[PDB]
Amino acid sequence: GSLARAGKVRGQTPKVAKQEKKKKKTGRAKRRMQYNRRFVNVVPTFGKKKGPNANS
């Protein structure tokens, strides 16, 4: 029971710089992109109804 370790994990976490990426669309264009990704594109579907951020 000591306060010596108070920022341990955040302090010892290796620092990774954020990568540069093109800006995300905002407003009506973002909603248009979401609608197109969910209702006009079917190629990602394979019959399993997997999630949009599936990793396996």
């Binding site: 579907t45 019959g47 399993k48 109804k49 997997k50 999630g51 396996s56």
Partner: peptide, 30 residues
């Protein structure tokens, strides 16, 4: 990986809720 199998095995484990969600995704929707 078949989510029916994953639910059968891991339903009582730390990932029971996740395998339940994956099973429900596969069961209805296509």
């Amino acid at each position: 990986t078949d989510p029916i199998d994953d639910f059968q095995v891991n339903w009582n484990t730390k990932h029971g809720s996740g395998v339940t969600r994956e099973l429900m995704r596969e069961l209805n929707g296509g």
